[PDB]
Amino acid sequence: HTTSQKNFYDNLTSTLLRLSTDKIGAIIAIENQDSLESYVNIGYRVTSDFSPELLVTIFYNKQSPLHDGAVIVRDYQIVSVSSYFPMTRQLIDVSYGSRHRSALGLTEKCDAIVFIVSETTGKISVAVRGVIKTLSSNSDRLQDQIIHYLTV
Amino acid sequence: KHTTSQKNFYDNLTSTLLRLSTDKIGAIIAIENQDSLESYVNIGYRVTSDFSPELLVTIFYNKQSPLHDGAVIVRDYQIVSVSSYFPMTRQLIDVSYGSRHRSALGLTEKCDAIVFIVSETTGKISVAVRGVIKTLSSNSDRLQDQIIHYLT
Numbered sequence: 001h002t003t004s005q006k007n008f009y010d011n012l013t014s015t016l017l018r019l020s021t022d023k024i025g026a027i028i029a030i031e032n033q034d035s036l037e038s039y040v041n042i043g044y045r046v047t048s049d050f051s052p053e054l055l056v057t058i059f060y061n062k063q064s065p066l067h068d069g070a071v072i073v074r075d076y077q078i079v080s081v082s083s084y085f086p087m088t089r090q091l092i093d094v095s096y097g098s099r100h101r102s103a104l105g106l107t108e109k110c111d112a113i114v115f116i117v118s119e120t121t122g123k124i125s126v127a128v129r130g131v132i133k134t135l136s137s138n139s140d141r142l143q144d145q146i147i148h149y150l151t152v
Numbered sequence: 153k154h155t156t157s158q159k160n161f162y163d164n165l166t167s168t169l170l171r172l173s174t175d176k177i178g179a180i181i182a183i184e185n186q187d188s189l190e191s192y193v194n195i196g197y198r199v200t201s202d203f204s205p206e207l208l209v210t211i212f213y214n215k216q217s218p219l220h221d222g223a224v225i226v227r228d229y230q231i232v233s234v235s236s237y238f239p240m241t242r243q244l245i246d247v248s249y250g251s252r253h254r255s256a257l258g259l260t261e262k263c264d265a266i267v268f269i270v271s272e273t274t275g276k277i278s279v280a281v282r283g284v285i286k287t288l289s290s291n292s293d294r295l296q297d298q299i300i301h302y303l304t
Contacts, residue, residue, distance in 0.1 A: 044202070044204070045201065045202070046200070046201040047198075049197070049198065053217045054219065056214070060217075064210045
């Protein structure tokens with residue numbers, strides 16, 4: 001109930017905070033009502049609990065292709081890595097990179113919530129319904145922000 | 153039982169062990185046969201995926217994550233768990249055996265699993281079956297042959 005949900009919020013926060021401080025680029029897409037099955041089939045099917053330990057294994061190896069593309073999460077479980085999304089059609093600030101545009105592109109087509117970490121700055125963003133917003137790197141505020149965007 | 157499936161697994165296991173070996177990365181991989189290892193699966197991180205050499209390498213090489221410790225369990229050529237621990241042997245054996253070696257002996261005494269080990273110290277490849285451990289070759293063509301032998 002609340003225990004699986006709250007562990008996911010704690011583990012997603014911790015993971016995003018880690019990738020941020022280490023400036024490791026990352027996309028983590030969270031399925032809602034719209035099926036991302038097509039995009040799962042584009043990447044590599046891996047099923048597991050959303051564990052910081054597994055996401056560290058993946059992302060802290062720049063040689064591995066698993067560190068590339070997006071992680072897709074369904075029902076608090078990882079279902080794929082290395083998934084690619086369509087680019088946004090919007091005119092967006094130049095500061096936003098490839099990952100940001102793929103994330104926006106996905107959310108323009110369906111109800112997925114996508115989090116992005118910037119490899120350049122370390123900043124954490126969320127894309128929801130064709131809108132992208134920057135989240136704080138402060139640990140306390142970030143968790144509340146993450147919960148808001150996943151419960152809205 | 154399909155020929156391409158077993159051949160692909162044999163190649164993937166061979167390339168994986170040779171690489172761990174040459175880079176002296178500690179590893180243990182248990183193959184389930186007729187005796188269920190479901191109890192040891194539930195004790196580790198449940199991770200379902202194809203047996204991909206890239207992913208196997210990021211698991212054991214990545215020292216920051218605890219995933220590199222303990223065993224990967226394989227069922228029907230698929231990964232089903234990582235960081236599974238096995239009971240160590242209760243036989244009086246030589247001190248030159250480390251944790252992984254005693255774990256493989258321990259497991260294979262209780263069931264028909266086949267457990268491959270790579271030493272972090274020497275990079276030697278061993279296999280454990282029915283409570284007996286033997287070193288394998290680091291020649292590619294031999295290792296294929298030995299792997300095929302022990303898995304039938």
